[PDB]
Motif scaffolding. Structure first.
Motif, mmCIF file in Angstrom:
data_model
loop_
_atom_site.group_PDB
_atom_site.id
_atom_site.type_symbol
_atom_site.label_atom_id
_atom_site.label_comp_id
_atom_site.label_asym_id
_atom_site.label_seq_id
_atom_site.Cartn_x
_atom_site.Cartn_y
_atom_site.Cartn_z
ATOM 1 N N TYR A 85 42.849 29.991 32.007
ATOM 2 C CA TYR A 85 41.838 29.792 33.083
ATOM 3 C C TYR A 85 41.182 31.130 33.367
ATOM 4 O O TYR A 85 41.752 32.018 33.999
ATOM 5 C CB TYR A 85 42.498 29.229 34.339
ATOM 6 C CG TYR A 85 41.532 28.741 35.395
ATOM 7 C CD1 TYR A 85 40.657 27.724 35.060
ATOM 8 C CD2 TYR A 85 41.539 29.219 36.707
ATOM 9 C CE1 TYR A 85 39.783 27.175 35.991
ATOM 10 C CE2 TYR A 85 40.640 28.718 37.637
ATOM 11 C CZ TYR A 85 39.769 27.699 37.286
ATOM 12 O OH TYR A 85 38.882 27.133 38.169
ATOM 13 N N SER A 86 39.982 31.305 32.839
ATOM 14 C CA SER A 86 39.291 32.608 32.889
ATOM 15 C C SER A 86 38.843 32.978 34.310
ATOM 16 O O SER A 86 38.532 32.092 35.115
ATOM 17 C CB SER A 86 38.128 32.617 31.936
ATOM 18 O OG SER A 86 37.127 31.699 32.316
ATOM 19 N N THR A 87 38.690 34.278 34.557
ATOM 20 C CA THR A 87 38.115 34.726 35.828
ATOM 21 C C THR A 87 36.647 34.283 35.884
ATOM 22 O O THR A 87 36.187 33.980 36.985
ATOM 23 C CB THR A 87 38.257 36.235 35.992
ATOM 24 O OG1 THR A 87 37.553 36.814 34.899
ATOM 25 C CG2 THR A 87 39.691 36.661 35.959
ATOM 26 N N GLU A 88 35.951 34.151 34.762
ATOM 27 C CA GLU A 88 34.542 33.698 34.764
ATOM 28 C C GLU A 88 34.459 32.255 35.271
ATOM 29 O O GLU A 88 33.587 31.948 36.079
ATOM 30 C CB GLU A 88 33.968 33.830 33.361
ATOM 31 C CG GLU A 88 33.835 35.275 32.916
ATOM 32 C CD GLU A 88 35.021 35.873 32.157
ATOM 33 O OE1 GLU A 88 36.130 35.276 32.112
ATOM 34 O OE2 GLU A 88 34.862 36.997 31.670
ATOM 35 N N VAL A 89 35.310 31.372 34.778
ATOM 36 C CA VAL A 89 35.297 29.958 35.213
ATOM 37 C C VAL A 89 35.720 29.952 36.676
ATOM 38 O O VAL A 89 35.103 29.219 37.446
ATOM 39 C CB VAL A 89 36.207 29.137 34.318
ATOM 40 C CG1 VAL A 89 36.470 27.792 34.968
ATOM 41 C CG2 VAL A 89 35.537 29.007 32.952
HETATM 42 CL CL CL Z 1 39.579 36.061 32.168
#
Ligand code: CL
Ligand code: CL
Ligand code: CL
Ligand code: CL
Ligand code: NA
Ligand code: NA
Ligand code: NA
Ligand code: NA
Ligand code: NA
Ligand code: NA
Ligand code: NA
Ligand code: NA
Ligand code: NA
Ligand code: NA
Ligand code: NA
Ligand code: NA
Lengths: 172, 172, 172, 172
Positions: free
Chosen positions: B8-12
């Motif tokens: 779960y990316s920081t961008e998402v």
């Molecule tokens: Cl990330």
């Protein structure tokens, strides 16, 4: 030829195959009419429902003819199905005029087959058409005539408003 | 970062927080639209009901996004909610045009998040958006397009009468 | 182009029209298969029912594609429907082989459209196909494979008796 | 002649009496077929039931003709009933062939009476035959053709086993 076939001419057998093609072509025309009225830039749900129900009726007509072909010992032969005459169907009035012309053509094909059956002395065919097709076609043409009169009375007055009211208060 | 967080990316995570803000802003816009149509000098109850129901749908969208943020181990961050773009919303036609522009903006934000999830190889996010948002948004935009067509057909004819009839016979 | 259309390529719109034609052609092929098995000199009621039910499934597939075309703001375009590949379909084994070839062709058309949607970044289309078509097609092909195996096991043994038993004890 | 008789020729009145005799002869043939299949050395209960039900149908046909004779003011005249053509009916295949020959003979007698009614301009008779006889006869002949095909497919394979399976899995 069939173990069951009795008093069933090759002329009637061929005309029944042609009539199946006409009914499936009509079903396809009503499918196109129905989805045209579901377009976001046309959006008359009652009109779409009216034509989709007729698509189902015409397919059921074709299926009844095919069952009868097999009951008499004839052989179903399927041909290409021509696409509908238009891609876009104009107003409710234009569409209902196109529908009554298509129903009159099916009616005339029924009357032609009835006359062939009479010439070939085939009372089972005459009974079949009278029982399942001729009265349904007359009732449908009368309903479409009633609709045409009501649409014309409304869109003479004020075209967009009259088309909305006909869809809301007559169709569903 | 979370004991549960996986793929779960920081961008998402950030884009999901922004999408929550967009959905709550939309809910607030629909609240303003609904109460405008309840004014004694506007008084279109079906229109008020249509927009109040959409206010509830958009808030439920935001709540689903927040539940998903916590299920993935992201952290909900709330920002100020901008007031709606107008204080008065004009006619039913004006209002429905403003609504379809707002839904297209939410749709484009969904498609942008889907593309980010695809770039980040996050199939849970892609599934979540496909399952709960993308099809609902397409269906809603189509319904609003159908409404716009019907309103335009009616108010071209006779504006006040057409707005009354649309409210009485389409909306509730 | 539509007031509602968003992220919907002309390539996908055209491929959807082609896929409608393929599904209606398949429906027509299954109609011919069904009525062949109702012939008095073929007379396998369970086989006729199996294919008539698939004719209805394929028509429902076409109708779902047309609804989706309108929901996205594309325009349905109907073409001629080619007649089925055969007038007579041989044994139950021959017919089931022809059916699994036709389903694999529809499956490959679905996978081709999915790949186009992926190339065009159209997640609503990808979701639509996954939700309503891809899993149904895999399940149907598996069922037809199971039938082919059972028919082959039976008609290797004793052809007429095996075709009767398969119709009586598997199909209805 | 009757106080009620109107447009009812002596030719039709006599042909109706002959048709009653044919239907009662057919009922008697089906009674013999039914009890043959109940013999301990034949013992096909489903076959016995099939023919006993047809014995009842043919008697009901005769009774409908007699009611119609009285409704038109004709006079029922009964003749001797010839015994059935065989004392023993062979296999299920032999019996079903004898039955379809007997039904075709009744059908041809119906078509001959229809043609007489047409020559005598008697539309009540034509309607009566179309409504109560012609379609029932076509449906029955088709069912018998379907049975013949299934029996032949089974007893080509392995005669005794195929006759058992047809009785168990088609007839009851
Ligand atoms: Cl990330
Ligand atoms: Cl002929
Ligand atoms: Cl494009
Ligand atoms: Cl006379
Ligand atoms: Na014939
Ligand atoms: Na003509
Ligand atoms: Na109607
Ligand atoms: Na992570
Ligand atoms: Na963007
Ligand atoms: Na609505
Ligand atoms: Na687009
Ligand atoms: Na390919
Ligand atoms: Na099955
Ligand atoms: Na008379
Ligand atoms: Na004769
Ligand atoms: Na039977």
């Amino acid at each position: 030829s069939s173990q069951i076939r009795q008093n069933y001419s090759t002329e009637v057998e061929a005309a029944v195959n042609r009539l199946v093609n006409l009914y499936l072509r009509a079903s396809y025309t009503y499918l196109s009419l129905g989805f045209y009225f579901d377009r976001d830039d046309v959006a008359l749900e009652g009109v779409c429902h009216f034509f989709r129900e007729l698509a189902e009726e015409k397919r059921e007509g074709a299926e009844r003819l095919l069952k009868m072909q097999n009951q008499r010992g004839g052989r179903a032969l399927f041909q290409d199905l021509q696409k509908p005459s238009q891609d876009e169907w104009g107003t409710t009035l234009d569409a209902m005029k196109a529908a009554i012309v298509l129903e009159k053509s099916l009616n005339q094909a029924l009357l032609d087959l009835h006359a062939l059956g009479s010439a070939q002395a085939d009372p089972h065919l005459c009974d079949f058409l009278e029982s399942h097709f001729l009265d349904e076609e007359v009732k449908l043409i009368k309903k479409m005539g009633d609709h045409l009169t009501n649409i014309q009375r409304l869109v003479g007055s004020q075209a967009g408003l009259g088309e909305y009211l006909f869809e809301r208060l007559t169709l569903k």
